[PDB]
Design a binder for this molecule. Structure first.
Ligand SMILES: CC[C@H]1O[C@]2(C)[C@H](OC(C)=O)[C@@]1(C)O[C@@H](/C=C/C=C/C=C/c1oc(=O)cc(OC)c1C)[C@@H]2O
Ligand SMILES: CC[C@H]1O[C@]2(C)[C@H](OC(C)=O)[C@@]1(C)O[C@@H](/C=C/C=C/C=C/c1oc(=O)cc(OC)c1C)[C@@H]2O
Ligand SMILES: Nc1ncnc2c1ncn2[C@@H]1O[C@H](COP(=O)(O)OP(=O)(O)NP(=O)(O)O)[C@@H](O)[C@H]1O
Ligand SMILES: Nc1ncnc2c1ncn2[C@@H]1O[C@H](COP(=O)(O)OP(=O)(O)NP(=O)(O)O)[C@@H](O)[C@H]1O
Ligand SMILES: [Mg+2]
Ligand SMILES: [Mg+2]
Lengths: 54, 487, 466, 14, 466, 128, 128
C-alpha cells in the first residue's frame, strides 16, 4: 500500500514542482526582458547626454 | 509684413522655424501658404518654433506663415454629434461641413475645487461585471487597462451603445452624449467602428475624433485635448458627456516622438519629464459639477495598453495615479474564455459606490463577498481534491457567479435585467445546477422575464430598489422558471 | 521696474530690463492680462536679461510684452485668517469666500532654521495602526514619510491618520495638496466642513488649505509646497503653536522641478532629472521641521515612479524623515491593507531606551520571524511546505499569522474592506504580538487573524469560523 | 521528496 | 533646378540651391556618375540648403558636384510589364533583361486611403490552404505575420500563396525583399522561375520582384518596401485586383529606419530605435488595405529581437497585424506540410461575428480536439495507450485523422513531389473537418487523409488502400 | 582576384568586432552621431558591404568563389548585442562556441544545437 | 594638523555618496560633460585624492597619523555598483552591513565574507 501512496504522492508533487518552475521561468524572463531593454536605453542616454554637452 | 506674417527659415523634424510673426501669442494657431496648420510653441528672440499639425513635406524654406490671433481651439456644440472629425474639428465623414456656432480652446485648465461635487449619478455600461463590481460614476475617470487584444475598446463600445436606452428616452438628465477619440489606431478600424455604432443607432449621439496610425504625431498628440473640449461643452451646460481616449499609450508615444525631436532630455523609457502632465491635465477635465454650476458632468474612460501584463511600467503607473480606479483585463482570462476578461480583485472604482444603484447594491453587494471566498480556493492547481463542506460550497458558487459575468458583445443589459440574473446566482437558484448550463439559463431565463414580466422589471427599475413584494415576486419567478428548465 | 517679455517657452519666460534688473527669487507681474500672472526670477542670463518661471499658463503672452518687478518674492497671507480657507501658490483665495484679510504677509522663500535652533526631544506618536505603531512608530514634532507606487494606499493612509490624529489635535493643521487630484481637494474640503474642522460661520476652523494640483502648469506645482510650508511656519514660530502638516504628494514638487529644468537650459542628471534635485529637496525639506520655538509634526506622501524606490526622487528623500512607511504593491495585491512593508519601514524611535524594551523586543521579534520566513521562501516556492522541517513549518505558521495580524481595517477604507474601521491601542498591539510569537495561538487558523483590530477579536473570528 | 509520506508516519509514530 | 553639393558625410549629402529649393521627399539626381545616384530630400536646413540621404555609395562625390532636382519623389515603372522582373529601389532593372518599359511611373511616397475610401467590412481572403483558411484566416487588405524561417517551407508557401491568388482571385503579387542577402535573392529568383511563378519566356509571370539588398545604404533598405508598395498599389488602384504584398522581412524595415534616423542625428528612443518608430510604420502599413477599388493584402516576415515580444520593434509591428502564420520545424519533422502550427497560428477575424457561426464553430472544434489530444499525448507514451475510453479513443483517432487532413499538396511542389497540387475551397474546407468532427469517416483510416485535397479524396485514397 | 579568375579563395576576418571598434572610434572623433553602444548608424552597412563581396560565381563568370569566415567576439554569450547582431543577420550561418562546453571537455566547443548552415546539405558530399 | 604634529586623529566622512552628488551637481552646472552615471568623469579622483591623505607618518615626521572611515550608501545592497566599487578600490578594506543580517538578529550586520581589512593582524594586539 505504502508504495502506491508513495509513487502517487511523488507524482503529483513533482507535477506541481514543474508547475511552479514554469510559473517562474515565465516570470523571470519578463524581468530579464524588461532589464535588457532598460540597460540599452540607459546607456544610450548616457552617450547622448555627454555628446550634447560639448 | 513681419508683424502678422513670417517666412519659414527651415522645416525639418516637424518643427518649422519661422522668421517674423512678431505678434503671435504663445500657443496661437498660425497658417501655412499650403493651408496647413501649426501652433506657436517657442517664442524666441528671433524666430518662432511652430509645431506643424500635418505632414511637414508640404512646408518649405521661405513659405508664408500667417497669424490667426486664435489660441488653438476647436469646433464645439451639439452639431458634431454623428460627425467623424479629425483632430482639428475638420469633418472626415465627407458628409458636409460641420455647422458649428461655438468654439473652444483645447488647452483650458480643469475646474477647481469649488465648482465640483462627489459623483452621484451612475454611468451605466450595461456590462455585468462592470456595473456590478466596478461602478463608474458620472464625472469619474476610470481607466481601462490591459495588454493588446484583451477587449479593451470592446468595453468602451458596449458602453456607448448602452446609452441609447436613455438618449431615446424621456429625461435629459438621464442621457449621455458619447465622444470617442482614436489615437494611433488603424482607420480600417475606426471606419468599421462607426459602422457598428451607426448600425446600432448610437452615432446619433456620438462624436468621433480620429488621429490615426497615419497622421502626424502632433495630430495624434492633439486629438484627445480636442475631444476633451467637445466633451466639455456638455459638462459645462448642465448636460452629461462620456469621453473615450483610445489609447493614451499611443498618444504618449506621439508626444515622445515630438519631444525627442525637439531634443528634450529623455528620461525613464526615453519619455520626456512632462508626460505625466500630458495626461493629468487632460484627465483633470473630466468632472462632476454641482448644481450651482449646472450639475453637468464629463466621464473619461481612457485606455492604456500594458506589455506582458506589466502594470508597473512608467506610463501605466502614471495613468493609474490620475484616474479614480482601473479595469484590468487579463490575457489569461481572455483565452480561458472568461470575457469580459476582467480581473475582479485587481480592478477598482475609487469613487463609484455612491454612483451605484441600490438594487445592484442589493445583489452585487453579496457577490464580491461570495467571490471573495472563491478567489482564494480557486488555485492555479488544475488537479486538486478537497474536503470540508464549507470551503467546498464556496468553490461552487464562484464557478457559477463567474459564468454570470461572462457577456457577449453588443448586448448591453438594462440595470434591472442585470439585478435580475445576478439575483438568481447570488440567491442560490443556480447552486443545484451545472456550470455549463449557466450561460444557457441566463439567456433563456432572461427572455422569459423580459417577455412575460415587464411588470416587475419596471417596478425594480422605477423603484430603483428591490421591495419586499418585488423580491418576493422575483423569488417565485426564479423558482418557477427553474422548475421547468430543461437541462 | 518694467521689463519686456523676450522669450517664451512653456513656463520659462525670459524678460529683459533696462534700468532695474530684479534679483533672483523676485516675483514679477506680467502686464496686460485678464488674471494675475506672476513670474518668479530664476537667474541672470547677463545682457541685462533675467530668466523666470511662470506661475500660471503662459498662453497669450507676446514678445515685447510689459512685465513689472514686484520688488520682492511671492508673498502670501499668513495669520489665523487663513484658517478655514483654501488658497493658491500665490496666496489668493480659491474658495470663493472673499479676500483673506490678514495683518501680515510672508514670502514663500525663507532660510531653514539654524543648527542651534534644532530640537532633539523624541516623543512617540501613537496612531492606532498596528504595523506602524509596532514596527516603525512615528514621533511628536517628527518627520514621517509614506512611500507608495501608484494606487497603493498613500492617500488613504494620510486620511486615516488625519482621522486618528489630526481630528483630536489641540493646535492647528495645514494640508497642502501638491500635484494631486482636484477632486481630492474637493473631497477633503467638504468633509472638513462636515466634521467641523472647517467652519464657514465662526473663526473656529483648525485647518488652513493650500492647493496646486495635477492641472497646474509646472511652476505652480514646483512652488505650492513652499506655499503650504510657509503657512505652517507662521503657526510654528509666530505663535509657538503645535502644528500638523499634511502634504500630498511631495514627489510632485520634484517632478515639477524636472519639468522646467530643461527649459532652464541645464544638462540633465541621471534619469533625465535636474542636476539640482538634491539641493532643491534640501532647502525645502529643511524648513519642514520642529524647532525650539514650535513643533511641526509632518506627514508627507511620496509617490514612487514605476514603483522604483531607487528612483532619484524617493531615493533622495529617505534621508529627510524620522520615520518612513514604505507601501508595497505586492502586499496590497495580496490583499493586505495597509500594504506596509514590515522589513522596509523604519523609525529613529525604534530604540529600547525610548519605546521601552518590551516594545523593542516584540518589534524585533516580529521582524526576525518574517526575515526567517523570507529565506525559506525560495524553496516553499518550488516544493511547497512538505520538505520543510517541523521546526521550519512552525516559523511559517507563526509568520503567516503574524503576517495576517499586521493588516487592519481603517474607517476611511470601510467601503472597501466591508468591515468596520478599527483603532488599536499600543499596549494592545505590543501584546497581541507577543502571544502570537509566544505560540499562544498556534491552534487558531490564519484566517482568524486577517483583517482585525485587537487580538481578542482574532480569537472570536476563530470561533465564528468554527 | 515524496510528498507528506515520511512525515505523516513520523508524526503519528509519536 | 540645379544645386551644388555642399557637404558629404558618409551617406548623407547636403545640397545647396540658388533659386528654388526641392521640397522634402523629392529625389535629386547626382550629375556625372558612372551610375545613378539618387539623393532623397529629408530636411530644409535653411539658407537654401537641403539635407538628403544617398540611396547608394557617396564614394567619390565632390563639394561643388552638380545635383539636379527631379522635382518629385522617387518614381518607378508600375504596371504589368513589371511582373516577373527584378527591380531596384528607384525602379531599376537588376535582372539584366533590359528596360522595364511600362506606361505609368508611380512616386513611392504616397498617402493612404482616406477614411471615406475605407471598406467598412471584414472579409476573409481564401488562399486554398486548409490550415490557413480554416484556423487562421487571412483578411482582405489585412496584414499577416509569418513566423518561422528555413527548412520549414517558407519559400514554398510564399510561392503557393502567389499562385493561388492568381488562380482563385485573378490577383497578382509583389515581392519586396527589405535587406535581402544577395545570395538569397538570386536563389529566390531561380526558384520561382523553376516553379513557374515567373516566366522568362512568356507573359505569364504572376509576381514582380523588388529588391533592397543588405549592402545597400540605410536609405535604400529604408525605402524599398515602399517601392514594392507602389507597384502593388497599381494592381489595386488602376486595375482593382486583389494584390498580395510580401515584405521580407518587416524587421529590417524598422532597422533601416533607425540607421537613417541616427544618421540624421536624431536622438534615439527606448531601446535605441527611432523616435519616429510608430509613424515610420504607420505611414507605410496604412497604405495596405481594402479600398473601394480593390485591396492589398500583406504577408510580412517577422524577426523578433532577443526573443523579446515586448521589444519595441516587434510590439510596434503587432499593432497592425490581423493574423499570424507560424511555420513550425517540429511539425515538418513529422513530415507534415504545409508545416503551419494549428494552435500557435492566429487570426483577428476568427470571430463568429465575422466568419459566421458555422465556420467559427468548426474551427473552434478542430482546435479543441487538437488541444485535447495534446493532453493524452503525455499519458499514451508513459502509461501506454489503453486506459483510454470509448471516448478518449475517439478524440485521438479523429484528432489524428484531423491533424493529417490539415496537411496538403501544393501545386508549386509538383516539379517532383509526383503528387498533384490541391487548392481546396473554403466550403470544402469547413465541410471536410466538419465531418471528421461529426464522425462520418471515423471508420476511415489515417493514411487515407494524408496529403489530399477535399474529403472526397480522403474516401478514394482509402479505396486504393483497401 | 582569385574568385574572379575561376579560382577559389577562403578568407578569415579575425575579428569584425575589433574593426567595428576602429570604425566607431573614427566616427565619434569626426563627430558623427552615436547610436546604441556609441556605434554610427552605418556600422551595419560597413559589414554588409564587406560580407557580401563573398560569393559563388557563374561559369559564365568563371565559376570562381570566395568563402568568408568572419569572427565575432561576443560578451558573456550576449549573441544579441549590437555588432554580434548585425553580422549574425548578414551571414549564412553561425558556429556557436561555448565555455561551459569547452571546460566540460567538448573541444572544439561547438554548440551543435545552436550552430547553423543555411547552405546545409547543398554543400555536403553524399558520403557525409 | 594632528597628523603632522605627532598627534593622532580619526575622521569619519559621513557619507561620501551625498558629496558625490554635490560634486555632480556643481560640476554639471559648470557645463562639464556628464560621465558614467551622470557623474563627472573624475569622481574616482574626487575621492582618491581625499582618502590618500589619511596616513601613518614615520618617526621622521612625527610618527603622527590620520585614520579615515568614509561611509558609502549602496542601493539594493549592490556592492558591485560603480560608485561603491570606486571607493572600495581606494580604501584599505570595507565593512559591509546587510539588512538581511540585521533583521536576522545579526547586529552589527557585518558580512564576514564580504568585509575585509588590508592591514591584517599587523593592526592587532597579540592578544587579539
Ligand atoms: C510578497 C509579500 C510579502 O509581504 C509580507 C510582509 C511577507 O513577506 C515577509 C517577509 O513576511 C510576504 C511574503 O507575504 C505577505 C503576506 C500576505 C498575506 C495575505 C493574506 C490574506 C488573507 O488571509 C487570510 O487569512 C484570509 C483572507 O481573506 C479572507 C485573506 C485575503 C506579507 O505581507
Ligand atoms: C508538435 C507536434 C504537434 O503538432 C500537431 C498539430 C499535433 O499537435 C496536436 C495539437 O494536434 C502534434 C502533437 O503532432 C503533429 C503531427 C504530425 C503528424 C505527422 C504524420 C506524418 C505521416 O503520417 C502518415 O500517416 C504517413 C506518413 O508517411 C507515409 C507521414 C510522414 C501535428 O502537426
Ligand atoms: N465580451 C466579449 N466576448 C467575446 N469576445 C469578445 C468580447 N469582447 C471582445 N471580444 C473579442 O476580442 C477581440 C478583441 O477585443 P478588442 O476590444 O479589440 O480588444 P483591445 O483590447 O481593444 N485590442 P487592441 O485594441 O487590438 O489592442 C474582439 O475582436 C473580439 O473578437
Ligand atoms: N487601507 C486600505 N484598505 C483597503 N483598501 C485600500 C486601502 N488603501 C488603499 N486601498 C485601496 O487602494 C485604492 C487606492 O488608494 P489610495 O489611497 O488612493 O492610493 P494612492 O497611493 O493614493 N494612489 P495614487 O495617489 O493614485 O498613487 C483605494 O481606493 C482602495 O481601493
Ligand atoms: Mg482597442
Ligand atoms: Mg493619492
Amino acid at each position: 500500500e505504502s508504495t502506491t501512496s508513495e509513487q502517487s504522492a511523488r507524482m503529483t508533487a513533482m507535477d506541481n514542482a514543474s508547475k511552479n518552475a514554469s510559473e517562474m521561468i515565465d516570470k523571470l524572463t519578463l524581468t530579464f526582458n524588461r532589464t535588457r531593454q532598460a540597460v540599452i536605453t540607459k546607456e544610450l542616454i548616457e552617450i547622448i547626454s555627454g555628446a550634447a554637452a560639448l | 509684413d513681419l508683424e502678422e506674417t513670417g517666412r519659414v527659415l527651415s522645416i525639418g523634424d516637424g518643427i518649422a522655424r519661422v522668421h517674423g510673426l512678431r505678434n503671435v501669442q504663445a500657443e496661437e494657431m498660425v497658417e501655412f501658404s499650403s493651408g496647413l496648420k501649426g501652433m506657436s510653441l517657442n517664442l524666441e528672440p528671433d524666430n518662432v518654433g511652430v509645431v506643424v499639425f500635418g505632414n511637414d513635406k508640404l512646408i518649405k524654406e521661405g513659405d508664408i506663415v500667417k497669424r490667426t490671433g486664435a489660441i488653438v481651439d476647436v469646433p464645439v456644440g451639439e452639431e458634431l454629434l454623428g460627425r467623424v472629425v479629425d483632430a482639428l474639428g475638420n469633418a472626415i465623414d465627407g458628409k458636409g461641413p460641420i455647422g458649428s456656432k461655438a468654439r473652444r480652446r483645447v488647452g483650458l485648465k480643469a475646474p477647481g475645487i469649488i465648482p465640483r461635487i462627489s459623483v452621484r449619478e451612475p454611468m451605466q455600461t450595461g456590462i455585468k461585471a462592470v456595473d456590478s463590481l466596478v461602478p463608474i460614476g458620472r464625472g469619474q475617470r476610470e481607466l481601462i487597462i490591459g495588454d493588446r487584444q484583451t477587449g479593451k475598446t470592446s468595453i468602451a463600445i458596449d458602453t456607448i451603445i448602452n446609452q441609447k436606452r436613455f438618449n431615446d428616452g424621456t429625461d435629459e438628465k438621464k442621457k449621455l452624449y458619447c465622444i470617442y477619440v482614436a489615437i494611433g489606431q488603424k482607420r480600417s478600424t475606426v471606419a468599421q467602428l462607426v459602422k457598428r455604432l451607426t448600425d446600432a443607432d448610437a452615432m446619433k449621439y456620438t462624436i468621433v475624433v480620429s488621429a490615426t496610425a497615419s497622421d502626424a504625431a502632433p495630430l495624434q498628440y492633439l486629438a484627445p485635448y480636442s475631444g476633451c473640449s467637445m466633451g466639455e461643452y456638455f459638462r459645462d451646460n448642465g448636460k452629461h458627456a462620456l469621453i473615450i481616449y483610445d489609447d493614451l499609450s499611443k498618444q504618449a508615444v506621439a508626444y515622445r516622438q515630438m519631444s525627442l525631436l525637439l531634443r528634450r532630455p529623455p528620461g525613464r523609457e526615453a519619455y520626456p519629464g512632462d508626460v505625466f502632465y500630458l495626461h493629468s491635465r487632460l484627465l483633470e477635465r473630466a468632472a462632476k459639477m454641482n448644481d450651482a454650476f449646472g450639475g453637468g458632468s464629463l466621464t473619461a474612460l481612457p485606455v492604456i495598453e500594458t506589455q506582458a501584463g506589466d502594470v508597473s511600467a512608467y506610463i501605466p503607473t502614471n495613468v493609474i495615479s490620475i484616474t479614480d480606479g482601473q479595469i484590468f483585463l487579463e490575457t489569461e482570462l481572455f483565452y480561458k474564455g472568461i470575457r469580459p476578461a476582467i480581473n475582479v480583485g485587481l480592478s477598482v472604482s475609487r469613487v463609484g459606490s455612491a454612483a451605484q444603484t441600490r438594487a445592484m447594491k442589493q445583489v452585487a453587494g453579496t457577490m464580491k463577498l461570495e467571490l471573495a471566498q472563491y478567489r482564494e480556493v480557486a488555485a492555479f492547481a488544475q488537479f486538486g481534491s478537497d474536503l470540508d463542506a464549507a470551503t467546498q460550497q464556496l468553490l461552487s458558487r464562484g464557478v457559477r457567479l463567474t459564468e454570470l459575468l461572462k457577456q457577449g458583445q453588443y448586448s448591453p443589459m438594462a440595470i434591472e435585467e442585470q439585478v435580475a440574473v445576478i439575483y438568481a446566482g447570488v440567491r442560490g437558484y443556480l447552486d443545484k445546477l451545472e456550470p455549463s448550463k449557466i450561460t444557457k439559463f441566463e439567456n433563456a431565463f432572461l427572455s422569459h422575464v423580459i417577455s412575460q414580466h415587464q411588470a416587475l422589471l419596471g417596478k425594480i427599475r422605477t423603484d430603483g430598489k428591490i421591495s419586499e413584494e418585488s423580491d418576493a415576486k422575483l423569488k417565485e419567478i426564479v423558482t418557477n422558471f427553474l422548475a421547468g428548465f430543461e437541462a | 521696474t518694467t521689463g519686456r517679455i523676450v522669450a517664451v517657452i512653456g513656463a520659462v519666460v525670459d524678460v529683459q530690463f533696462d534700468e532695474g534688473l530684479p534679483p533672483i527669487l523676485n516675483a514679477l507681474e506680467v502686464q496686460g492680462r485678464e488674471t494675475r500672472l506672476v513670474l518668479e526670477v530664476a537667474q541672470h542670463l547677463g545682457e541685462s536679461t533675467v530668466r523666470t518661471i511662470a506661475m500660471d499658463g503662459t498662453e497669450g503672452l507676446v514678445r515685447g510684452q510689459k512685465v513689472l518687478d514686484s520688488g520682492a518674492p511671492i508673498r502670501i497671507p499668513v495669520g489665523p485668517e487663513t484658517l478655514g480657507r483654501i488658497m493658491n501658490v500665490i496666496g489668493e483665495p480659491i474658495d470663493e469666500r472673499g479676500p483673506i484679510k490678514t495683518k501680515q504677509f510672508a514670502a514663500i522663500h525663507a532660510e531653514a532654521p539654524e543648527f542651534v535652533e534644532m530640537s532633539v526631544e523624541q516623543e512617540i506618536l501613537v496612531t492606532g495602526i498596528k504595523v506602524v505603531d509596532l514596527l516603525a512608530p512615528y514621533a511628536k514634532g517628527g518627520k514621517i514619510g509614506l512611500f507608495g507606487g501608484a494606487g497603493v494606499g498613500k492617500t488613504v493612509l494620510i486620511m486615516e491618520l488625519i482621522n486618528n490624529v489630526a481630528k483630536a489635535h489641540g493646535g492647528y493643521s495645514v494640508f497642502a495638496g501638491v500635484g494631486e487630484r482636484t477632486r481630492e481637494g474637493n473631497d477633503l474640503y467638504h468633509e472638513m466642513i462636515e466634521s467641523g474642522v472647517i467652519n464657514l460661520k465662526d473663526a473656529t476652523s483648525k485647518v488652513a488649505l493650500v492647493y496646486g494640483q495635477m492641472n497646474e502648469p509646472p511652476g505652480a506645482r514646483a512652488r505650492v509646497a513652499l506655499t503650504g510650508l510657509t503657512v505652517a511656519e507662521y503657526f510654528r514660530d509666530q505663535e509657538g503653536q503645535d502644528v500638523l502638516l499634511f502634504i500630498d504628494n511631495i514627489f510632485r514638487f520634484t517632478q515639477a522641478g524636472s519639468e522646467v529644468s530643461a527649459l532652464l537650459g541645464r544638462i540633465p542628471s541621471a534619469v533625465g532629472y535636474q542636476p539640482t534635485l538634491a539641493t532643491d529637496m534640501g532647502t525645502m525639506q529643511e524648513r519642514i521641521t520642529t524647532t525650539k520655538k514650535g513643533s511641526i509634526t509632518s506627514v508627507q506622501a511620496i509617490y514612487v515612479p514605476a514603483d522604483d524606490l531607487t528612483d532619484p526622487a524617493p531615493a533622495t528623500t529617505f534621508a529627510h524623515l524620522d520615520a518612513t512607511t514604505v507601501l508595497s504593491r505586492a502586499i496590497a495585491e495580496l490583499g493586505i491593507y495597509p500594504a506596509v512593508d514590515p522589513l522596509d519601514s523604519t523609525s529613529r524611535i525604534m530604540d529600547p531606551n525610548i519605546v521601552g524594551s518590551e516594545h523593542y523586543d516584540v518589534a524585533r521579534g516580529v521582524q526576525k520571524i518574517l526575515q526567517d520566513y523570507k529565506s525559506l521562501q525560495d524553496i516553499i516556492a518550488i516544493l511547497g511546505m512538505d520538505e520543510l522541517s517541523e521546526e521550519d513549518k512552525l516559523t511559517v505558521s507563526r509568520a503567516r499569522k503574524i503576517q495576517r495580524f499586521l493588516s487592519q481595517p481603517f474607517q476611511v477604507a470601510e467601503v472597501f474592506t466591508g468591515h468596520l474601521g478599527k483603532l488599536v491601542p499600543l499596549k494592545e498591539t505590543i501584546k497581541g504580538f507577543q502571544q502570537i510569537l509566544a505560540g499562544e495561538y498556534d491552534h487558531l487558523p490564519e484566517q482568524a487573524f486577517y483583517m482585525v483590530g485587537p487580538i481578542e477579536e482574532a480569537v472570536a473570528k476563530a470561533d465564528k469560523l468554527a | 521528496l515524496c510528498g507528506a509520506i515520511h512525515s505523516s508516519v513520523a508524526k503519528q509514530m509519536k
